[PDB]
Amino acid sequence: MEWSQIFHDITTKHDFKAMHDFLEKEYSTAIVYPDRENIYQAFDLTPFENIKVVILGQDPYHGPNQAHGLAFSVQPNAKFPPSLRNMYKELADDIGCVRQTPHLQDWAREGVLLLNTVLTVRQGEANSHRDIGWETFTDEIIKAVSDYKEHVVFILWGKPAQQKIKLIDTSKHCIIKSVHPSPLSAYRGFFGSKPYSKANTYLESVGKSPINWCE
């Protein structure tokens, strides 16, 4: 199955016309991230039947040369934000490898759907595009993956992610879940959580090729 069928169901279950018209004005009367072309970069690079793993972010990075359409990823040249520096420290411990690039495009290729719950944001304005219908959209995406996939890992970082457990048929699917890799939260148990190895143990266990997390 393809994202375009799934997207068709969601866009006929709910009326995203008001949202589409809105984001049209935003992109032509504001500075919105990411680029219009990259809003779905996650779906682009992790085709539906390639999803092994789902990592929820929240909000796209609101700064310049950061967001490009994947949760947690900044453009190659850009500098590491905190949550992402910590994600790499835990990866270094869990798996062993030390990633240099803060770009997660290769994780997407490898079957990690890096899905933020909101997919647009105005430059500088931290939660500018909450409550325009994105959350409905991304809820239906988590549902869709649970519904039409057979054995998938959902990694839920921070309480807001963990509100999405009620969308995820854990009779069918795995859930690895911890406090957020924010420096504010990371030490109440994201460090040592080892979700990369855990994810692969689970995938190995349903006869699926593990995620190469490294370069």
Place this chain on the structure above:
Amino acid sequence: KQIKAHLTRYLEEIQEYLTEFVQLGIEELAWGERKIPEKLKGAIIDTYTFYDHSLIYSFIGTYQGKIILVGYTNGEYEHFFYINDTVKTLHSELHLLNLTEEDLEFV
């Protein structure tokens, strides 16, 4: 910039900064000794952590558009300079940061 500048000027002397926004369960933060304020329990709070790649991280929490937390981290060790429960300040050290409660109701 009001509270950001102050909180940063202070921590330096005891260079510039960007802002990472994250929603966190109140619970996710390191309270340690402290019970979580009653009126805050099971709250999803907006957090702004200030940083640069010379590196220690300062931050500000808010909930229903009210400043509730200000603090800094040093690995496992969080300290709160400020804790407010929406209704009342429970802890303050704003005087360190040359800030008043009224610098918060007004930003």
